[PDB]
RNA sequence: UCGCCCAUCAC
RNA sequence: UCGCCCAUCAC
RNA sequence: GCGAGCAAUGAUGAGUGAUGGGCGAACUGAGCUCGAAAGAGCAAUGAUGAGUGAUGGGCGAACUGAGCUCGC
């Protein structure tokens, strides 16, 4: 009944005719990654509600675990990979998608394959600021090497410099066309120039004022244009990194102490504001219950730790180090709360590395 | 300094090399592209790329005299364990601008190097997922004319057979490079090749078998038809 | 330059507040480092607080200015945490220092408070 | 035009040397977020580039990637001891891909510097 | 009743799977415990796999049924993890056991596979 | 110990 | 120019 | 069988190799630790073994330089 595809999701009958198909309402590369690894999505929730409201119940899918999430959620779901929906839809897309269907397969398939690797840098906002300076320094080297390329090539064909002022189009001319007597009307259209630009350039083929480069003088100028082509590919490598990494956001406490312990500690302080105001000496003892009471009211020994005892390097650990680790944990915890509350940037794997150096030093000392 | 010529199969080419030997090649899908750092060959308005039989089972099998080659211009094909392809990428040149290639890979890194090459090799689509589990990529593929497997994983008989239930047409074909060690490391290679020959003939017409010595040892290549 | 500053200053007032640390330390009552500064800040008892301009990460002291509005006490900054630690007599650095009792320095801390109340405005 | 191309080839070598110094300053300042110990150990810019090409991710170091690059044993008695106690942080194996590619692009610029010296002679 | 015991087991074949473990123990090739079961259930040619009926949490062995449906292998179960450990010959427990070569058990594995394939159908 | 795919380059 | 074996310290 | 051509102002040998990144040939699979010692606690829902970095002693290692070619 269901069939599972890139150009939306599809429903077919027992005789192999179409019933309905629907297009996606999040980025299709993320919708395919869910549906391929067997968890169900909002546009398929709507297509199976359409199929239910039409008066069908026998919801055979292609995939076993997509069908698991469907019947675990409450639907009348079963599984057959060779079912008549997939046996029609994947045999002839022309009847359903249109003749250019392979463009839509291509543009999402390469994106899914570029996306199937997870990301966890330690201080990624700083590690993207360096790529914003790399974009400033990359246009800066392009705007230097192309000035040398202009001045050197204008010895041989100066009639081009003021006519192709956008630097990539001049580099592509000097890379791909190269020597001035190669220039004809067809190779300028194979370079993507318009008729208004091709009346000029060809105007100069019979009457240029430039002085001669020989066959392996023009070669080193072509080597320079072939390496500057890779600097435009490096600009794409930076543009494709910035479009992926500059959208990240992560909380620090959630990584330094783990989400459930962070969320608990924020409330024993009354709030995240208080956890970002209070001293480490107080953050050390938050929620110690009747051990803090008898330290104040009855004048007992101070508690070594409150709810920070649930920290995964204190809870299991031997006595010699539990107090020393609790003090340094309360300092590094007070820092992580101040970063999440005042700054909204991420450094949590640095804060871990420093507490990990202090724990190694505690072993090296005791 | 070479002479360029046509081969016995369409889309496949030969060069006469300066050493006085025949070497196998394809006409480059777009001219000026590099694909495995290879010896590219300029011609009189054309560009060609070598298909090296000293590091490619497909090229070595053609030099060992493989008879039945079903991949041709304009057709549709699926490759299982593709990475990018010193051995494999040449199917894109042979199928050309009018045909279709699906490249499936299980190996969690190498397909990342095919991803840039397809910004001009726009007849290929790369998809990451286990070739043993033909359901893993169901949304980005179709029925095809040909299926190929060349990495020789322990599952390889299931890799070709069950992909050929979902993805191979009536009057369709396939190819597989079988190695004995992935199924048993103790019994004879020609005996393991019988156990595969009797399972492969439990679903296909088996049209050819070839051993890959004196290039690569205890590996063989089979060719099949779906009726 | 850090985020947490609220008004601009030259070396004026700042060199005089560093000079006040250099005489409150052995004529009066003082604490050094930011968690002891924060104890004397939260429970009000710090009459003047001094913070560095070069804390790294900057965020560890970023509470001290707004918390000194919330309790109503004067605050000031100085150009280097190592030199503030050396003024507090210790051999490491200090991100902040707190005055509990000025000792001999009362007219000087009252000048600093009266001239900082020209800027917290 | 070749006597004028003497001037353009001499200026092109200093311009290529200036953009190599610029992109390697960017590579040094960026890779200092992952392994900053390298910046005063390796003053020779092409060895810093060849390190970031060949190693990529700073947690995957060994002797071979130093010894084959022609670092001395007097340089191998550093780098390796900084595996966990480098003053740097952590870039990811997935994020450092762009910095590995930046290093392979800059190694092509030493080939450009050499192609220009091959023409200065001519 | 756990989610992995997806077919009702009769007063027959269960004791034959217990016996197949007992006689493979010195004569076949065999693994015991669920992570070693898991790797010999993925890798090479397993012949049969056996589970206990009292595994708790059930989730640790709940992966074995769908893992047997992807790879064409039969599974069966026996009333206790402590008896399944004793059948493998260890004085602890075992949640599952896997057969790589049956040894003496080859006719028992053939009878179990034939009868279970037509039971579940 | 023994194989299979992968980019980039050579004598 | 490079590898291998044994003994040994810190975490 | 014998002669002929070339060569230290350079004969001979080799279609083969380098550098970088994963996967596959069923990781080990039950011991460990405390105790005077029987014993006790942990363990197949995983005992134990397999780390990285550094310090010290020992062991071993590979272009030739004249041959090549032939007619009957």
Coordinates of C-alpha atoms in Angstrom, one line a residue, chain B:
Chain B
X1 CA 52.6 9.2 -28.1
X2 CA 49.8 6.7 -28.7
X3 CA 47.0 5.5 -31.1
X4 CA 43.3 5.5 -29.9
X5 CA 40.9 2.7 -31.1
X6 CA 37.4 1.1 -30.4
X7 CA 36.9 -2.1 -28.3
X8 CA 34.6 -5.2 -28.8
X9 CA 32.1 -3.6 -26.4
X10 CA 30.3 -0.2 -27.0
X11 CA 31.5 2.8 -24.9
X12 CA 34.9 0.9 -24.2
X13 CA 38.1 2.0 -26.0
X14 CA 41.7 0.8 -26.5
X15 CA 45.1 2.6 -26.8
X16 CA 48.2 1.3 -28.5
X17 CA 50.9 2.3 -26.0
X18 CA 54.5 3.5 -26.6
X19 CA 55.7 0.1 -25.2
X20 CA 54.0 -1.6 -28.2
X21 CA 51.1 -3.1 -26.1
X22 CA 47.2 -2.8 -26.1
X23 CA 45.8 -1.0 -23.0
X24 CA 42.1 -0.5 -22.1
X25 CA 40.4 2.9 -21.7
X26 CA 37.2 5.0 -21.8
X27 CA 36.4 8.5 -23.2
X28 CA 36.3 10.8 -20.1
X29 CA 32.7 11.7 -19.0
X30 CA 33.8 15.4 -19.0
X31 CA 37.3 16.4 -20.4
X32 CA 39.9 17.7 -17.9
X33 CA 38.5 15.7 -14.8
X34 CA 40.8 13.5 -12.7
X35 CA 39.1 10.5 -10.9
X36 CA 41.9 8.2 -9.4
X37 CA 45.0 10.4 -10.0
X38 CA 45.2 8.4 -13.3
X39 CA 47.1 8.5 -16.6
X40 CA 44.7 10.7 -18.7
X41 CA 45.4 10.7 -22.5
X42 CA 44.8 13.8 -24.7
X43 CA 43.6 13.2 -28.3
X44 CA 42.6 15.4 -31.4
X45 CA 39.6 17.2 -29.7
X46 CA 38.9 14.3 -27.2
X47 CA 40.2 13.1 -23.7
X48 CA 40.6 9.4 -22.5
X49 CA 41.3 7.6 -19.2
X50 CA 43.0 4.3 -18.5
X51 CA 41.3 1.3 -16.7
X52 CA 44.3 -0.3 -15.0
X53 CA 44.3 -4.2 -15.0
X54 CA 47.2 -4.2 -12.5
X55 CA 44.8 -2.7 -9.7
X56 CA 41.3 -3.4 -11.1
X57 CA 39.4 -6.8 -11.1
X58 CA 37.0 -5.5 -13.9
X59 CA 40.0 -4.5 -16.1
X60 CA 42.0 -7.8 -15.3
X61 CA 38.9 -9.9 -16.1
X62 CA 38.6 -8.2 -19.5
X63 CA 42.3 -8.9 -20.1
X64 CA 41.7 -12.6 -19.0
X65 CA 39.1 -12.6 -21.9
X66 CA 35.7 -12.1 -20.3
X67 CA 33.0 -12.7 -23.1
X68 CA 29.6 -11.3 -21.7
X69 CA 29.6 -7.6 -20.8
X70 CA 26.0 -6.2 -20.4
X71 CA 26.9 -2.5 -19.5
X72 CA 26.3 -0.3 -22.7
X73 CA 25.5 3.4 -23.5
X74 CA 22.2 5.0 -22.2
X75 CA 21.4 2.0 -19.9
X76 CA 20.6 1.9 -16.1
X77 CA 22.9 0.1 -13.6
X78 CA 23.4 -0.4 -9.8
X79 CA 26.9 -1.0 -8.3
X80 CA 27.2 -2.5 -4.8
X81 CA 30.5 -1.7 -3.0
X82 CA 31.6 1.2 -5.3
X83 CA 33.6 3.6 -3.1
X84 CA 34.5 6.0 -6.1
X85 CA 36.4 3.5 -8.3
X86 CA 39.9 2.9 -9.7
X87 CA 38.1 -0.4 -10.8
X88 CA 34.5 0.8 -10.9
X89 CA 34.1 4.5 -12.0
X90 CA 34.5 3.6 -15.8
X91 CA 30.9 2.4 -15.9
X92 CA 29.9 6.2 -15.8
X93 CA 32.1 6.8 -19.0
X94 CA 30.7 3.7 -20.8
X95 CA 27.0 4.5 -19.9
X96 CA 27.6 8.2 -20.8
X97 CA 25.5 11.4 -20.6
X98 CA 22.2 9.6 -21.6
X99 CA 22.2 6.7 -18.9
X100 CA 21.9 6.2 -15.1
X101 CA 24.2 4.8 -12.4
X102 CA 23.4 4.1 -8.7
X103 CA 26.5 3.8 -6.5
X104 CA 25.8 2.1 -3.1
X105 CA 28.4 1.8 -0.4
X106 CA 28.4 0.3 3.2
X107 CA 32.0 1.4 4.1
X108 CA 31.4 4.5 6.3
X109 CA 34.1 6.9 4.7
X110 CA 35.2 6.2 1.1
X111 CA 31.9 7.3 -0.6
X112 CA 32.7 10.9 0.6
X113 CA 35.4 11.1 -2.2
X114 CA 32.8 10.2 -4.9
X115 CA 30.5 13.1 -3.7
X116 CA 32.7 15.9 -5.3
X117 CA 33.3 14.0 -8.6
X118 CA 29.5 13.8 -9.2
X119 CA 29.2 17.7 -9.3
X120 CA 30.2 17.0 -13.0
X121 CA 29.6 13.1 -13.2
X122 CA 25.8 13.9 -13.1
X123 CA 24.9 10.4 -14.5
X124 CA 26.0 8.8 -11.0
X125 CA 24.1 9.1 -7.7
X126 CA 26.0 8.0 -4.5
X127 CA 24.0 6.5 -1.6
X128 CA 25.5 5.3 1.8
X129 CA 23.8 2.0 3.1
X130 CA 24.4 -1.8 3.6
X131 CA 24.3 -3.6 0.2
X132 CA 23.4 -6.8 2.3
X133 CA 20.1 -5.1 3.3
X134 CA 18.5 -3.9 -0.1
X135 CA 15.8 -2.0 2.0
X136 CA 18.5 0.6 3.3
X137 CA 18.4 2.8 0.1
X138 CA 14.8 2.1 -1.2
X139 CA 13.9 5.8 -1.7
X140 CA 16.8 6.8 -4.1
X141 CA 16.8 3.8 -6.6
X142 CA 14.7 2.1 -9.3
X143 CA 14.5 -1.1 -11.4
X144 CA 17.8 -1.3 -13.5
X145 CA 19.2 -3.2 -16.5
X146 CA 22.4 -4.5 -14.6
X147 CA 23.6 -5.1 -11.0
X148 CA 27.3 -5.4 -10.0
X149 CA 29.1 -6.5 -6.7
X150 CA 33.0 -6.4 -6.5
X151 CA 34.2 -6.2 -2.8
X152 CA 33.4 -9.8 -2.0
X153 CA 32.0 -9.5 1.6
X154 CA 30.9 -12.7 3.5
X155 CA 27.2 -11.9 2.4
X156 CA 27.9 -11.4 -1.3
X157 CA 25.6 -14.2 -2.7
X158 CA 22.7 -12.5 -0.8
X159 CA 23.9 -9.0 -1.9
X160 CA 23.4 -9.8 -5.6
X161 CA 20.4 -12.2 -5.3
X162 CA 18.0 -10.1 -3.1
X163 CA 18.9 -6.8 -4.7
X164 CA 18.0 -8.7 -8.0
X165 CA 14.5 -9.4 -6.5
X166 CA 13.7 -5.7 -5.8
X167 CA 15.8 -3.9 -8.5
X168 CA 16.3 -6.2 -11.6
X169 CA 13.9 -6.2 -14.6
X170 CA 12.7 -9.1 -16.8
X171 CA 15.4 -9.6 -19.4
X172 CA 18.0 -8.0 -17.0
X173 CA 21.6 -9.0 -16.2
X174 CA 24.2 -9.0 -13.4
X175 CA 27.9 -9.6 -12.4
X176 CA 29.7 -10.6 -9.2
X177 CA 33.4 -11.0 -8.2
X178 CA 33.5 -14.1 -5.8
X179 CA 36.5 -14.8 -3.4
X180 CA 36.5 -18.1 -1.5
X181 CA 38.0 -16.9 1.9
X182 CA 34.9 -14.7 2.7
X183 CA 32.7 -17.9 2.8
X184 CA 35.3 -20.5 3.9
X185 CA 39.1 -20.1 4.6
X186 CA 39.9 -24.0 4.7
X187 CA 38.1 -25.7 1.7
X188 CA 39.3 -25.4 -2.0
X189 CA 38.4 -22.2 -3.9
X190 CA 37.0 -24.2 -6.9
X191 CA 34.7 -26.0 -4.3
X192 CA 33.5 -22.8 -2.7
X193 CA 32.9 -21.5 -6.3
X194 CA 30.6 -24.6 -6.8
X195 CA 28.6 -23.8 -3.7
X196 CA 28.1 -20.3 -5.1
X197 CA 27.5 -21.7 -8.6
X198 CA 24.6 -23.9 -7.2
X199 CA 23.1 -21.0 -5.1
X200 CA 23.4 -18.4 -8.0
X201 CA 21.8 -21.0 -10.4
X202 CA 18.9 -21.3 -7.8
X203 CA 17.7 -17.8 -9.0
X204 CA 19.6 -16.9 -12.3
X205 CA 20.7 -18.3 -15.7
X206 CA 24.5 -18.3 -15.1
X207 CA 26.0 -17.3 -18.5
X208 CA 29.8 -17.1 -17.6
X209 CA 32.5 -18.0 -15.0
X210 CA 36.2 -16.8 -15.1
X211 CA 39.2 -17.3 -12.7
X212 CA 41.3 -14.1 -12.2
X213 CA 44.8 -15.8 -12.1
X214 CA 47.5 -14.8 -13.3
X215 CA 46.5 -11.3 -12.0
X216 CA 44.6 -11.8 -8.7
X217 CA 44.5 -15.2 -6.8
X218 CA 41.5 -17.3 -5.5
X219 CA 39.1 -14.6 -6.9
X220 CA 36.7 -15.4 -9.7
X221 CA 34.0 -13.4 -11.8
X222 CA 30.5 -14.7 -12.7
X223 CA 27.9 -13.2 -15.1
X224 CA 24.1 -13.8 -14.9
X225 CA 20.7 -13.2 -16.6
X226 CA 17.3 -12.7 -15.0
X227 CA 14.9 -14.3 -17.6

